[PDB]
Amino acid sequence: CAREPIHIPGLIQPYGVLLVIDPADGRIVQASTTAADLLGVPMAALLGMPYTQVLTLPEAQPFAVDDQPQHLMHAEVRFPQRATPPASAWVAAWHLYPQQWLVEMEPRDAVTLREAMPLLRSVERDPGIAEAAVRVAKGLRSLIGFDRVMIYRFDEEWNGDIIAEARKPELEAYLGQHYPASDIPAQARALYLRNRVRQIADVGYQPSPIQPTVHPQLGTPVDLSDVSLRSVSPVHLEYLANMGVTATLVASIVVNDALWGLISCHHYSPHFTNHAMRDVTDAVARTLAGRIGALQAVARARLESVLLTVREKLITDFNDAEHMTVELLDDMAPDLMDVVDADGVAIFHGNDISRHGTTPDVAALRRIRDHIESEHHEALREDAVGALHVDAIGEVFPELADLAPLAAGFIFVPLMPQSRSALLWTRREQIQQIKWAGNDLWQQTVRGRARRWSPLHLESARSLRVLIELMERKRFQQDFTLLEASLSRLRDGVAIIERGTANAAHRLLFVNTAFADVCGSDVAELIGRELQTDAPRANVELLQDALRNGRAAYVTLPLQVSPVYRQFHLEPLPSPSGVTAHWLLQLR
Amino acid sequence: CAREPIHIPGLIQPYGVLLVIDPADGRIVQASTTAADLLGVPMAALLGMPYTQVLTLPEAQPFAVDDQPQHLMHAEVRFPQRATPPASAWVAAWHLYPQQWLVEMEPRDARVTLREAMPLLRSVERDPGIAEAAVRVAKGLRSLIGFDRVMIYRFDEEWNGDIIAEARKPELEAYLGQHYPASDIPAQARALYLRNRVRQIADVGYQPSPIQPTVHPQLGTPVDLSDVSLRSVSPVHLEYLANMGVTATLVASIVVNDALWGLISCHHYSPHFTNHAMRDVTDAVARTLAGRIGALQAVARARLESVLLTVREKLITDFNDAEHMTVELLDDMAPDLMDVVDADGVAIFHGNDISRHGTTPDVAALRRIRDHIESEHHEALREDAVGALHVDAIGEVFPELADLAPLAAGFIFVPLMPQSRSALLWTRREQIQQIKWAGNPRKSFDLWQQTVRGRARRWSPLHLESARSLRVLIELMERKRFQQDFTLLEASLSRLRDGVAIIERGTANAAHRLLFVNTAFADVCGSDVAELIGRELQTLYASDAPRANVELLQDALRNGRAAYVTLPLQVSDGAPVYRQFHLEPLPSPSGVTAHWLLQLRD
Numbered sequence A: 001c002a003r004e005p006i007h008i009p010g011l012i013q014p015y016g017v018l019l020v021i022d023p024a025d026g027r028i029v030q031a032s033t034t035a036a037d038l039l040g041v042p043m044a045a046l047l048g049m050p051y052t053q054v055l056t057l058p059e060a061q062p063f064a065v066d067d068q069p070q071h072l073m074h075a076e077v078r079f080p081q082r083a084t085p086p087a088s089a090w091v092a093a094w095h096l097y098p099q100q101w102l103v104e105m106e107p108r109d110a111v112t113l114r115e116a117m118p119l120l121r122s123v124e125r126d127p128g129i130a131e132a133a134v135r136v137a138k139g140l141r142s143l144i145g146f147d148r149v150m151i152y153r154f155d156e157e158w159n160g161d162i163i164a165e166a167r168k169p170e171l172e173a174y175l176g177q178h179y180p181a182s183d184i185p186a187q188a189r190a191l192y193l194r195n196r197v198r199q200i201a202d203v204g205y206q207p208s209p210i211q212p213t214v215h216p217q218l219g220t221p222v223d224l225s226d227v228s229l230r231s232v233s234p235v236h237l238e239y240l241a242n243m244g245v246t247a248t249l250v251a252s253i254v255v256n257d258a259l260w261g262l263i264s265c266h267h268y269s270p271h272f273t274n275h276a277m278r279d280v281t282d283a284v285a286r287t288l289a290g291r292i293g294a295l296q297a298v299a300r301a302r303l304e305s306v307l308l309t310v311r312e313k314l315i316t317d318f319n320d321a322e323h324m325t326v327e328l329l330d331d332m333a334p335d336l337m338d339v340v341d342a343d344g345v346a347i348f349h350g351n352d353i354s355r356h357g358t359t360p361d362v363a364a365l366r367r368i369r370d371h372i373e374s375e376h377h378e379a380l381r382e383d384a385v386g387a388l389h390v391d392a393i394g395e396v397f398p399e400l401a402d403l404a405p406l407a408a409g410f411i412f413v414p415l416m417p418q419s420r421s422a423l424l425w426t427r428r429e430q431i432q433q434i435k436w437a438g439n440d441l442w443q444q445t446v447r448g449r450a451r452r453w454s455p456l457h458l459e460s461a462r463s464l465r466v467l468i469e470l471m472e473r474k475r476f477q478q479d480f481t482l483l484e485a486s487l488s489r490l491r492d493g494v495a496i497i498e499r500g501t502a503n504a505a506h507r508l509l510f511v512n513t514a515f516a517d518v519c520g521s522d523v524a525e526l527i528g529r530e531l532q533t534d535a536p537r538a539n540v541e542l543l544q545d546a547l548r549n550g551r552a553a554y555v556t557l558p559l560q561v562s563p564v565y566r567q568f569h570l571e572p573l574p575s576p577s578g579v580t581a582h583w584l585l586q587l588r
Numbered sequence B: 001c002a003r004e005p006i007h008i009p010g011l012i013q014p015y016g017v018l019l020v021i022d023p024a025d026g027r028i029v030q031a032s033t034t035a036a037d038l039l040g041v042p043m044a045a046l047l048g049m050p051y052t053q054v055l056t057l058p059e060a061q062p063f064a065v066d067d068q069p070q071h072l073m074h075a076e077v078r079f080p081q082r083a084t085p086p087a088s089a090w091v092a093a094w095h096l097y098p099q100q101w102l103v104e105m106e107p108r109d110a111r112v113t114l115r116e117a118m119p120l121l122r123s124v125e126r127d128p129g130i131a132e133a134a135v136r137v138a139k140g141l142r143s144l145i146g147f148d149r150v151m152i153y154r155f156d157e158e159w160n161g162d163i164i165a166e167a168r169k170p171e172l173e174a175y176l177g178q179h180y181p182a183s184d185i186p187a188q189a190r191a192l193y194l195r196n197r198v199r200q201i202a203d204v205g206y207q208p209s210p211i212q213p214t215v216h217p218q219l220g221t222p223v224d225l226s227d228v229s230l231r232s233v234s235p236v237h238l239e240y241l242a243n244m245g246v247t248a249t250l251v252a253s254i255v256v257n258d259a260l261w262g263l264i265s266c267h268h269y270s271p272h273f274t275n276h277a278m279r280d281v282t283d284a285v286a287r288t289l290a291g292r293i294g295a296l297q298a299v300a301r302a303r304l305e306s307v308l309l310t311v312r313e314k315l316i317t318d319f320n321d322a323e324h325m326t327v328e329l330l331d332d333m334a335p336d337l338m339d340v341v342d343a344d345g346v347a348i349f350h351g352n353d354i355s356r357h358g359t360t361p362d363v364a365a366l367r368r369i370r371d372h373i374e375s376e377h378h379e380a381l382r383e384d385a386v387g388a389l390h391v392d393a394i395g396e397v398f399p400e401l402a403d404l405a406p407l408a409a410g411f412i413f414v415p416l417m418p419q420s421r422s423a424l425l426w427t428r429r430e431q432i433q434q435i436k437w438a439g440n441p442r443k444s445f446d447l448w449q450q451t452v453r454g455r456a457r458r459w460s461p462l463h464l465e466s467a468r469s470l471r472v473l474i475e476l477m478e479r480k481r482f483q484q485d486f487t488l489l490e491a492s493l494s495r496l497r498d499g500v501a502i503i504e505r506g507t508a509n510a511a512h513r514l515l516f517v518n519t520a521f522a523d524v525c526g527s528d529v530a531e532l533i534g535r536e537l538q539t540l541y542a543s544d545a546p547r548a549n550v551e552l553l554q555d556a557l558r559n560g561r562a563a564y565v566t567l568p569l570q571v572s573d574g575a576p577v578y579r580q581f582h583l584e585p586l587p588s589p590s591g592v593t594a595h596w597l598l599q600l601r602d
């Protein structure tokens, strides 16, 4: 239903009056039916008439707008065309666009902003959100006389929850009450980011329409997006009626230029909150929004700084010991779980796992790792940022439906199906209990949903992929040396030849003890020397052919002995190009 | 100096009146000398008298406070002791604490004032960047309130303030750009500015009327004015404002993420009183300036962090993609590697090798820095540093590398470890600063203009955590190196004719299993390479094998020594195969046998 315009209804809340003027001539092109009564001229002659003639404004004047449409705040207005029509003092404001303008007027009515000030310095300097959230609810319920004031905090999915609420001693609270995202469509949520503070004076009013529905010259309906005399959606009107309420004032809590929440208000008797008190509620909205976003900042900072202290202790201790013992890992578990605030963690290293804290069993961890690195969930890896994470496992991996009491959520590094070394942090099932609006009262329990993964705790995880490469390097570093030592404790005398790209000749890469001794010259002086160190012309030709063509050769040939003829077994080593790049040489 | 007490001066600015009441009855325990004149009754009988006697407060009343001390805003007050005491409208406010209270009163004055302020507060809430709004305040506030000079004093890291915005008269000279010492506003004062947001000196060099009972007659404690706006400021500051000429101040506090980001300092060279409605309009503009900038600081921060990660991850991917580090691979990495840290130069190292991109010192100079960093005397530096090592001025940290400053005056060196082989060095070249000072109980005026050489653009913490977030590219570089060398050698040992296999030693609950096995070894058993990897060494030999012979084999496995024994193999078909097991203990850093090489020939 979010498909409704609302910004272009063609109807005005009766309480005030609207007049759309052409900026060329200054003549009223469009006017609401409530205008003809206020001003001294019926709809017929009121239309096409120059605005100056019909209404007078002393404080400020409308003007020519280039591109940025400015607005003129609520100022004194008088009706010279009528002989005594001052049912109340009339105050008018302007919406000055480049194509056309819009003037809106409403009564003045009724120790105001100076009386608000204590409450704004009250919140300003104070801790946590709830404390400020209630300081509003309570402080606002006292300043503007409302029967129910509440703070409607939005979440990730756009489902609102009433965190703070100040009602009458009688009545029942909607505190704790969760509501659908659908109760406030995206369409509307936009308007309460433009047109900050909204007011429905009387629910079930008579909507007085803008008589020339479309612009007589432009052929376009009037955009009330910025107009505060806006006729709200009938979908919501019947909804407020079915909730009882006859009046509503909804302030927007815009934190770091985004809709964090609303200060929704309920008056069960009809009530008009004049432009003055309407701007007082905006002061308390922005003031709350203020140190909410500054409190969000303090928390953020404090956490970032202690998360790095942990992170770097891990980095150091990890790079320190060259031998990942079972004891090493248990000195790392209190801290590895903390840098991400997980309840469990499982360190993998090829068919091996090291479980710490509250993590599923050895076999279950393998079932998750198998299912993650899966071909159908290869799109998941593609889309994820630096690592993969779930808030509810039951959705992402339907096969792993269960496993939720231990791993309902997790973070997984590497994003790549690199295998060998991997890491998995896990937050177990955290059963929620959503007190609905009624999808009167209902109480759905959410199973399988773990504590939502913090982005602070998510970039700190990506800021650890260096411990996966640290793990992986240290593995190859040990295996290479194991094999180097191996080939060095051989009797067959072997050496590795790196192919020269015709820019250089075929030099030596690796050489074992048994090879360096048969020449006489030790290991250090043979590394980096050409294989071309008398011999038969036909025989060396066979040797160089395999070096040329990049093939194999076995030829008995004389050495440089202090003649030592030794058989040369040359084996081309596999290459990613297939093109021979290295050659193993054994001699027995 | 920062050790001066203030907050309990025992003196009041003459312009107003103070009265400390005991909350048990309502009796004035302490009173300022300026009270006896305005209240009527002299100091003698005014003391110990129920406040109810001079009470003429209609608007609101004081009350019993539990723990959180609330305040009552400026409301109408009168004096019933005298038939026409002043000819000026008097207004009083309250500071209600749980132990005692405090009532302060001052004139109402003239020049609706808040409704007229609203446009300007709307205009900043919309304004971009910190600066554009900082001037909207300075200019908008200078017009609203008649101050001869309004300025926005932004604190820098050290607590040295800089006047970023300033709205003065057409005459007089600007302090715009003027940097000041942190010492000019001690930490003890900076605290009070965070409690009392709006502050004013009506006349510099006033007669300070003291609170006659200096200490509480019951408590025995001096009055903590703090929250009291009639507070007598420090004489250290009074002589300072006098030496700057000024006769009146009005200093608002810009408190951003409940921390002192700045002040809206004001100067009136003629004496000036700022009323109750006035004082609070400047607070509204200070709650907005603090607000809009704290949220603008957030937007910027977020936008930068998110585009810093886009770069970071492009590097990560492209780096892990190609398995051989070509010079062109490094040529497309340079625009982005320099960006993720916003350095002017970068030098990628890989064992006596360097790849310089942008504005980095010469190949030889980079080696002189790398040598000096990994130095034994500067091993303490690596110990203390966070994830990586960084300098803002090289000339201090490495005095030997005094020069090199026009290219590498600052840098981020990583790995922190003297791991060598692979390393990375980002560098910001010399950025000659020009700090326009106030002067160096001062005589101020003179803008001294110190020039700072060898100091590069200060290293951003956003650019510092995005630097630690690249440490994985040194380990990526390093793994890929060993990954290639190991595999080169694995392929080597695999294309062997002797028939060799590596045995990983077992323990108390683990037997001796096989780590690596070649094709010449896997064929003599028959069973291919893949089945034998992980196979226990005790499987390999037959179950008919000589008791004395296997004992010799297991002895070398036990004691961790060498053995050479001809023994029968586990023959799949049933063909007797007896090869001479050459078992060589492989060198270990402990010396304790960890692995074994098993050659076979007999």
Ligand SMILES: */C=C/C1=C(C)C(=O)N/C1=C\C1=NC(=C\c2[nH]c(/C=C3\NC(=O)C(C=C)=C3C)c(C)c2CCC(=O)O)/C(CCC(=O)O)=C1C
Pocket (backbone or CB within 6 Å): A001, A002, A004, A006, A174, A179, A182, A183, A184, A185, A188, A198, A199, A200, A231, A232, A233, A235, A236, A239, A248, A249, A250, A262, A264, A265, A437
């Ligand atoms: C089409 C879907 C809708 C459902 C379902 C529903 O309940 N409302 C729907 C649409 C509209 N809601 C609009 C505005 C709106 N809705 C709320 C919701 C609540 N307010 C409350 O006080 C409580 C509980 C105490 C709830 C659940 C509010 C506060 C508002 C803004 C109110 C205002 O205008 O003052 C809306 C927009 C209409 C418009 O403004 O033109 C639509 C279409």
Ligand SMILES: */C=C/C1=C(C)C(=O)N/C1=C\C1=NC(=C\c2[nH]c(/C=C3\NC(=O)C(C=C)=C3C)c(C)c2CCC(=O)O)/C(CCC(=O)O)=C1C
Pocket (backbone or CB within 6 Å): B001, B002, B004, B006, B007, B161, B175, B180, B183, B184, B185, B186, B189, B199, B200, B201, B232, B233, B234, B236, B237, B240, B249, B250, B251, B263, B265, B441, B442
């Ligand atoms: C003991 C150290 C001090 C030196 C030296 C000095 O010059 N002042 C010292 C002490 C105090 N300063 C206090 C307040 C204060 N200082 C400043 C700084 C400036 N004011 C300016 O106009 C300029 C440049 C034009 C600068 C750099 C300000 C703005 C303030 C606050 C003014 C006020 O609102 O009163 C101070 C605290 C006194 C108090 O309020 O009790 C001390 C001790």
